[PDB]
Amino acid sequence: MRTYEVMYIVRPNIEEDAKKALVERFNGILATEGAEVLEAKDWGKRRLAYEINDFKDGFYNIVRVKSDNNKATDEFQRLAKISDDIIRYMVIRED
Amino acid sequence: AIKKYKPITNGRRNMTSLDFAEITKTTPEKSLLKPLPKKAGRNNQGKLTVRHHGGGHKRQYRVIDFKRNKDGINAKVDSIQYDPNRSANIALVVYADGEKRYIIAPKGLEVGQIVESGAEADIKVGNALPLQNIPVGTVVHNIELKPGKGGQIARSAGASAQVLGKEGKYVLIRLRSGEVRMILSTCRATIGQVGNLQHELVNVGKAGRSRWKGIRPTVRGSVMNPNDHPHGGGEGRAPIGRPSPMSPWGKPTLGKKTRRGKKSSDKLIVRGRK
Amino acid sequence: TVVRKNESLEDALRRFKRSVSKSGTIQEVRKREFYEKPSVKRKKKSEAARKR
Amino acid sequence: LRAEERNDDLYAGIDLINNKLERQVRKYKTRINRKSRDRGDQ
Amino acid sequence: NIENGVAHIRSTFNNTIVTITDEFGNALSWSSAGALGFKGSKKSTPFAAQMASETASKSAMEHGLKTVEVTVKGPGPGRESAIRALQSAGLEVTAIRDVTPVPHNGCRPPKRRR
Amino acid sequence: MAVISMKQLLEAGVHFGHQTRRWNPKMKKYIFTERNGIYIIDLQKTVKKVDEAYNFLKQVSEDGGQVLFVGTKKQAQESVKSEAERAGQFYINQRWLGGLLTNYKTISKRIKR
Amino acid sequence: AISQERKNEIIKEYRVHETDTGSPEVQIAVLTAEINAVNEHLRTHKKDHHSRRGLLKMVGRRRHLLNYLRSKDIQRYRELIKSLGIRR
Amino acid sequence: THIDYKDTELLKRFISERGKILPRRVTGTSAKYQRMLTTAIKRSRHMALLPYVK
RNA sequence: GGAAAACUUGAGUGCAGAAGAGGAAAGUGGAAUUCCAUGUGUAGCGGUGAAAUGCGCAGAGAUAUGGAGGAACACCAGUGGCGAAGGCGACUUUCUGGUCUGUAACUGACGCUGAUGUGCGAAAGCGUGGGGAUCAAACAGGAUUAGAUACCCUGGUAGUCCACGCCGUAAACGAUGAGUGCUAAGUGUUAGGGGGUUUCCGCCCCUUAGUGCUGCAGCUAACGCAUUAAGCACUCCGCCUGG
């Protein structure tokens, strides 16, 4: 009943199956408690405009969630601050 | 955190106690207790060598580990308990290995929370890990001063110390005193601030709560004769009549510094007390 | 933050003197030379807008 | 610096002449003590 | 170390100060207006910047760092007169930046001056 | 970078065309619309043409060839001389002489002059 | 406030006849949903004072309709107190 | 329409030559476009698609 | 005025669209200030109408990286927006209040004002604890002056900030109570609604309700006010009757 669009950024200095291991924990988190992801589109490497945790590049992600609970995405907000890889994150409701 | 007593009595009037809401189990753990007889200011010769100590309430000693040795084994917390022998609370942690032991309870510590005491530990409240592996800036307590001896520093209730920087085989740290000291890098210190923060705020409000603590009353020097104290008797009340206030044994007691210099840790103190 | 080359220094200044005047540096730090009262800047901005 | 009193007491009137004299000097000095003006040249 | 560096000036409302350094800043040489016998309130002049700039630049002498690409970090009267006087030393000023600290309305500034 | 950006390209005013009733039907591909008797040159598509105009003219001078610049419209006469000197190429300001590419065995007879 | 599928549900029981929203007892019931929803919000948010005069105004618009409903038929007023719990 | 905060190219013609915001006085947009713009320019500052200063 | 009915404009709910620094709680983020640690580096820095107190050779300032912490949110930003007032300005999510527009389905005077009462109410204060970066009463010191306890400068405590209880006062001001009608126009602007057009979106056109600036009638003692009345009316409340 509510349409969310998260976007989270990971480190540039990670290898291949370290990257795709971290995206597949979150899309299970972003399916928990009746969340049922529309799709998970992934941008490539972007030269991000300034210097967070003295990095120069980032791998972006776009996951669109259709929930009614706000139980999946605040769980995402809880864990993405804990992990030192996923560097920034932002959910936004679209109406 | 604290309860105020209604003034039903003159001795109960301004007295302010501490409700024990952080305490979850009011019974000690029978295998970690130990007899603690009172040596009321008296040394092995039998005579009183520090004043103002006497008969308080009877106390058991709870053996808690200030050295944190069991590396990489998790430890759930049973309970936060009362300890008469220190200002802080204590925390009965139970290892997955099976052994039970107490640590001093940090500020935010709950039951059912795991605690790792090793070098490959996450930087969380209650975890013990060497000062090399502790990142700069975090507050920390139960600090070892020599590797293996156990934590000694910042250990009373509400005490903490923040890691300031790192020398070759030393780390800088700022004490609750305000003093900046070098502590050897291969020394433990547990992450976080130790709890029971409102211990300093009790108004014990009564001449008898002080006697239950074991604190015998202190007679002033200026109400003595001049063989009991250097501030001994004039006629009537007298001013102290000397260039400085002096102790009962004839040492100047107001302002004069008594740190014994030519000492080994003189190289390690960076900034004095603030 | 503009690089000016292939010329003299008395012409890179002419770029730089108007690449600072079209920026919030000199008019910004002259504003924050002293704390103004939180209801006198609402009139100071009103005088700097009614005159345009 | 001028001042006038039309009293008859020639000791109490000068208590008012010196009052008018002391006021007029302070007018003169604060006129010329506005040298302290922060004027920075270009 | 030869012919690569960063020149830092920050002319405040008093005492134009200049420190030339390398491209990864390590303070090669510096000079001020107070280091030229300007005791007080003569330091807030463009003429003080006419001598203070090159007397750190020409008295660097440790590596021959002869390019500058100056950086401006202060609102002052001798702001552009310290880079004009830097080509009196003649050190190929190639990138002028106004890197001044501008807050995002962060702290409380001090009182008004009556 | 590669192309002219969108801001300064239409600030010059290249989106204007000539008048409707004065139209060539083959230019339908390169017209976005007409507003008040005036046509509107497709601005996104001429960027897709000026880069292709940039691509070969890059590599013509790579061979060392000579590109001729001609301009005779009276409001664009001396805008092509000053750009040929910066390029080091050969310009035309006045009218076409009538054979300076084809009968130039009699024009170079007068460039010899 | 409350959702429309919550709001359209509560106008089914107290409706007097089909397509008669705006009736007094069908707009008191949707108030009592909105009363009970906002002071549960206000229970955990005790500092929200600007939302409190939104509550205190629609308390007043419920009271002015209960006082209205007694003036023309008392037997309908007794049924609404029993259907959804109000005092007085 | 509605400005999406990922569409950087139409969103960075509105940013300044240092990273500031052009006012609608000098750009020429409408009122409700400018403040629907400014809630999208500042979500794009937060996820490093645009700087705060250059 | 009472009673029994009937009506739809007032009032309220529907349905469909919007706009918003309206509140509350929890997260996230960047620039700057201060302090500390370090590298490199050398005599002043700082400050003023002029100086001095202060700071620095136990390496200052300046510069570069990293850290900690508190406070605010540049640009957008506007005689703009929202709220009953006080007031409200980073960003995101949750929870929640109000207004406006349009449609006419529905209820059928359900309305307005409101003594006593009951709740909100800037700052400075007070209490119990936190936290303490800048700023800063009191206070200390240096200059000015004819003189100081003022102005200016260095330093600095409560406070400024958070949580919970209070206090309940401001030039709390549009120095103008609330409600509903009616009475020349011109002109900006806001959310729209339409629109005619379109524009490469541009615009320019008619439309509720806001928000300004001009200006008749009328009003005022005069300034002035003038569809946002201080004009013409009716209701109710607060209040004044020399200093």
mmCIF file of all heavy atoms in Angstrom, chain D residues 7-18:
data_model
loop_
_atom_site.group_PDB
_atom_site.id
_atom_site.type_symbol
_atom_site.label_atom_id
_atom_site.label_comp_id
_atom_site.label_asym_id
_atom_site.label_seq_id
_atom_site.Cartn_x
_atom_site.Cartn_y
_atom_site.Cartn_z
ATOM 1 N N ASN D 7 21.333 86.528 38.880
ATOM 2 C CA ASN D 7 21.117 86.503 40.315
ATOM 3 C C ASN D 7 21.779 87.711 40.971
ATOM 4 O O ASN D 7 22.576 88.428 40.362
ATOM 5 C CB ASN D 7 21.662 85.211 40.921
ATOM 6 C CG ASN D 7 20.841 83.999 40.542
ATOM 7 O OD1 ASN D 7 19.610 84.047 40.531
ATOM 8 N ND2 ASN D 7 21.517 82.900 40.236
ATOM 9 N N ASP D 8 21.440 87.929 42.238
ATOM 10 C CA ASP D 8 22.058 88.991 43.017
ATOM 11 C C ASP D 8 23.178 88.472 43.906
ATOM 12 O O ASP D 8 24.134 89.205 44.178
ATOM 13 C CB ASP D 8 21.002 89.695 43.881
ATOM 14 C CG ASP D 8 21.430 91.085 44.325
ATOM 15 O OD1 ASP D 8 22.519 91.544 43.930
ATOM 16 O OD2 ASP D 8 20.663 91.728 45.075
ATOM 17 N N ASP D 9 23.091 87.220 44.346
ATOM 18 C CA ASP D 9 24.176 86.594 45.093
ATOM 19 C C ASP D 9 25.346 86.332 44.154
ATOM 20 O O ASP D 9 25.264 85.474 43.271
ATOM 21 C CB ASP D 9 23.698 85.297 45.738
ATOM 22 C CG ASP D 9 22.727 85.535 46.873
ATOM 23 O OD1 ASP D 9 22.815 86.603 47.514
ATOM 24 O OD2 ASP D 9 21.883 84.654 47.131
ATOM 25 N N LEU D 10 26.435 87.065 44.351
ATOM 26 C CA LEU D 10 27.634 86.912 43.536
ATOM 27 C C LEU D 10 28.535 85.763 43.990
ATOM 28 O O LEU D 10 29.673 85.671 43.526
ATOM 29 C CB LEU D 10 28.404 88.239 43.501
ATOM 30 C CG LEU D 10 28.670 89.012 44.798
ATOM 31 C CD1 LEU D 10 29.909 88.544 45.547
ATOM 32 C CD2 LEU D 10 28.766 90.496 44.475
ATOM 33 N N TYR D 11 28.061 84.902 44.887
ATOM 34 C CA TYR D 11 28.711 83.635 45.188
ATOM 35 C C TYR D 11 27.892 82.431 44.757
ATOM 36 O O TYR D 11 28.468 81.419 44.355
ATOM 37 C CB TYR D 11 29.003 83.523 46.691
ATOM 38 C CG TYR D 11 30.138 84.398 47.175
ATOM 39 C CD1 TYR D 11 30.261 84.723 48.519
ATOM 40 C CD2 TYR D 11 31.080 84.908 46.286
ATOM 41 C CE1 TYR D 11 31.293 85.526 48.968
ATOM 42 C CE2 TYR D 11 32.116 85.711 46.723
ATOM 43 C CZ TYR D 11 32.219 86.017 48.064
ATOM 44 O OH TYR D 11 33.250 86.817 48.498
ATOM 45 N N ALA D 12 26.565 82.522 44.836
ATOM 46 C CA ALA D 12 25.702 81.445 44.372
ATOM 47 C C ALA D 12 25.475 81.485 42.868
ATOM 48 O O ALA D 12 25.156 80.449 42.277
ATOM 49 C CB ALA D 12 24.358 81.503 45.099
ATOM 50 N N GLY D 13 25.620 82.654 42.242
ATOM 51 C CA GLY D 13 25.441 82.739 40.802
ATOM 52 C C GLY D 13 26.574 82.085 40.035
ATOM 53 O O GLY D 13 26.362 81.515 38.961
ATOM 54 N N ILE D 14 27.792 82.151 40.579
ATOM 55 C CA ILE D 14 28.946 81.524 39.948
ATOM 56 C C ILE D 14 28.900 80.005 40.111
ATOM 57 O O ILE D 14 29.513 79.271 39.327
ATOM 58 C CB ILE D 14 30.206 82.197 40.527
ATOM 59 C CG1 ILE D 14 30.153 83.684 40.203
ATOM 60 C CG2 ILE D 14 31.501 81.662 39.941
ATOM 61 C CD1 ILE D 14 31.204 84.491 40.880
ATOM 62 N N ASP D 15 28.108 79.504 41.063
ATOM 63 C CA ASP D 15 27.809 78.077 41.112
ATOM 64 C C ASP D 15 26.966 77.621 39.926
ATOM 65 O O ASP D 15 26.947 76.423 39.620
ATOM 66 C CB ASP D 15 27.091 77.733 42.417
ATOM 67 C CG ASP D 15 27.979 77.900 43.634
ATOM 68 O OD1 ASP D 15 29.209 77.755 43.491
ATOM 69 O OD2 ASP D 15 27.445 78.173 44.731
ATOM 70 N N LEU D 16 26.271 78.542 39.255
ATOM 71 C CA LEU D 16 25.538 78.247 38.031
ATOM 72 C C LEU D 16 26.300 78.640 36.772
ATOM 73 O O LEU D 16 26.061 78.052 35.713
ATOM 74 C CB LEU D 16 24.174 78.950 38.033
ATOM 75 C CG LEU D 16 22.996 78.314 38.783
ATOM 76 C CD1 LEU D 16 23.086 78.485 40.297
ATOM 77 C CD2 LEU D 16 21.671 78.847 38.258
ATOM 78 N N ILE D 17 27.199 79.623 36.861
ATOM 79 C CA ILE D 17 28.068 79.957 35.735
ATOM 80 C C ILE D 17 29.026 78.811 35.443
ATOM 81 O O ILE D 17 29.203 78.407 34.289
ATOM 82 C CB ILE D 17 28.822 81.270 36.020
ATOM 83 C CG1 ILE D 17 27.861 82.460 36.019
ATOM 84 C CG2 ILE D 17 29.945 81.485 35.027
ATOM 85 C CD1 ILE D 17 27.234 82.726 34.670
ATOM 86 N N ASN D 18 29.629 78.245 36.493
ATOM 87 C CA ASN D 18 30.528 77.109 36.323
ATOM 88 C C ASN D 18 29.772 75.871 35.855
ATOM 89 O O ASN D 18 30.355 74.997 35.206
ATOM 90 C CB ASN D 18 31.248 76.812 37.636
ATOM 91 C CG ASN D 18 32.486 75.962 37.448
ATOM 92 O OD1 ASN D 18 32.890 75.659 36.325
ATOM 93 N ND2 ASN D 18 33.092 75.561 38.554
#
